[PDB]
Design a binder for this molecule. Structure first.
Ligand SMILES: CCOC(=O)[C@]1(CS)N[C@H](C(=O)O)C(C)(C)S1
Ligand SMILES: [Zn+2]
Ligand SMILES: [Zn+2]
Ligand SMILES: [Zn+2]
Length: 231
């Protein structure tokens, strides 16, 4: 039922409805000789939509906007990028040209600039210290501490008990650490503990890549990170 990597051609974007007014968006990209899936989120905010993360590149993000218009038919008015990598900000310029207001923490905007990646326009305040949470429209944004990257945010949809972990959370089928070049391996398990403590009621946990599950994905990610640490 959830679209798997093997079922989405590069260039196309699938929407998967999780709850009333909550969808995930799924895209793919070929990278370094393999094909990877990538998740983001769409949350209804009255008669508008909040987007979480691009669809990993300009072409996919243009397709994402077309697919949202076709399937949902409400305007995407704001988008938040949850860290500075290309699977989260790549496509920000597309969103901006289409009139979407793009947002990220000041730490994400800085790291994207250093990396030469696309830079969301607006700066989200109130997320600079581990454990910080702010409401943004229909979601809560939470900075759990450094993990997959120094700047990674997670997103919670209280009306639906959906926790979007982004790339700080691994799918169960991923048993080796991924891209950890920008990670804080030492802090990542403690950051995951903060997520668990703040969102114990979550019913649907979405990783940045791959299949959703429950809160077990948090301990799974800790296990994989610790294994990599001891490599
Ligand atoms: C575009 C370069 O790549 C990325 O933007 C990510 C960011 S998390 N890196 C991952 C990796 O290198 O494994 C990935 C799953 C391919 S997506
Ligand atoms: Zn990343
Ligand atoms: Zn990623
Ligand atoms: Zn596991």
């Amino acid at each position: 039922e959830y679209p798997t990597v093997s079922e989405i051609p590069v260039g196309e974007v699938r929407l998967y409805q999780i709850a009333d007014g909550v969808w995930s968006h799924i895209a793919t990209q070929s990278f370094d000789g393999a094909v990877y899936p990538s998740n983001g989120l769409i949350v209804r905010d009255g008669d508008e939509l909040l987007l979480i993360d691009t669809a990993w590149g300009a072409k996919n993000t243009a397709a994402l906007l077309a697919e949202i218009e076709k399937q949902i038919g409400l305007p995407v008015t704001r988008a938040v990028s949850t860290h500075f990598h290309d699977d989260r900000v790549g496509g920000v310029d597309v969103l901006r040209a289409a009139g979407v207001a793009t947002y990220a923490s000041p730490s994400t905007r800085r790291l994207a600039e250093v990396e030469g990646n696309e830079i969301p326009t607006h700066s989200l305040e109130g997320l600079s210290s581990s454990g910080d949470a702010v409401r943004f429209g229909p979601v809560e944004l939470f900075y759990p501490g450094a993990a997959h990257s120094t700047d990674n945010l997670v997103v919670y949809v209280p009306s639906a008990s959906v926790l979007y972990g982004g790339c700080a959370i691994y799918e169960l089928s991923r048993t080796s650490a991924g891209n950890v070049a920008d990670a804080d391996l030492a802090e990542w398990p403690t950051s995951i503990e903060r997520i668990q403590q703040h969102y114990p009621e979550a019913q649907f946990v979405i990783p940045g890549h791959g299949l959703p599950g429950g809160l077990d994905l948090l301990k799974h990610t800790t296990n994989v990170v610790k294994a990599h640490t001891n490599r």
